[PDB]
């Protein structure tokens, strides 16, 4: 995020980091329950990647994080990689997350819920802060 | 890249107005947000765009794509979760 600010630690408890086996963060995701993470299809997750929950500072060794293995990747069959439309994948975890003060689920909308133009929302992540 | 988790608030746009920036690249399963002085950027993909509804944070978008330079005056594009939630529910129920 360019021109954002640091979050309060633990205040976005559904936010996960997707890391490869070298420990490199490549994408975010959101916990929707103890067994399932929603992410983007174009992230290209495999079952060799890791879901990290409960993290704030990726440079700290002292946080009580959860490193969760992925059992199966469900890329939406309507995903179109040429247009990047329907850009969603579900990850079923092999190991359930343990919910706590710092790890918990985001709500999903109903299909008919309305979010009007001009509403102020929030996004979070460990993406670049400057290009 | 940052070590510590970042946040930003930003407004939702309509698809019709988002098309002034992105043209026919905007499809019905996309929602645009931003152009407000902040931008999602590389490495944010897959993460949440959440809006508060009835006191609870709700997943409205999934960070997807946008400007190759993460311009803060151009809207970011997010997967529109209302268009996708029936597939989510079908998948959880079968697995």
């Amino acid at each position: 995020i360019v021109n954002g600010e640091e979050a309060v630690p633990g205040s976005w408890p559904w936010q996960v980091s997707l890391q490869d086996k070298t420990g490199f963060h490549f994408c975010g995701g959101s916990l929707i329950n103890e067994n399932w993470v929603v992410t983007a299809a174009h992230c290209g997750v495999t079952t060799s990647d890791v879901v990290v929950a409960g993290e704030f500072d990726q440079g700290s060794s002292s946080e009580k994080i959860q490193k969760l293995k992925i059992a199966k990747v469900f890329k939406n069959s309507k995903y179109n990689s040429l247009t990047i439309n329907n850009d969603i994948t579900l990850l079923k975890l092999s190991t359930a997350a343990s919910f706590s003060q710092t790890v918990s689920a985001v709500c999903l909308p109903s299909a008919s819920d309305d979010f009007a133009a001009g509403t102020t929302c929030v996004t979070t992540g460990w993406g670049l802060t400057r290009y | 890249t940052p070590d510590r988790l970042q946040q930003a608030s930003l407004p939702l746009l309509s698809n019709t107005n988002c098309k002034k920036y992105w043209g026919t690249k905007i499809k019905d399963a996309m929602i645009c947000a931003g152009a407000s002085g902040v931008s999602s950027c590389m490495g944010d993909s897959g993460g949440p765009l959440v809006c508060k509804k009835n006191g609870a944070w709700t997943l409205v978008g999934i960070v997807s794509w946008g400007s190759s330079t993460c311009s803060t005056s151009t809207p970011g594009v997010y997967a529109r979760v209302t268009a996708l939630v029936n597939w989510v529910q079908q998948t959880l129920a079968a697995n």
Binding site: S11, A105, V106, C107 | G55, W57
Partner: peptide
């Protein structure tokens, strides 16, 4: 869902 134990500050 959707209600953090540690409240975000925006």
């Amino acid at each position: 869902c959707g209600v953090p134990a540690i409240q975000p500050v925006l």
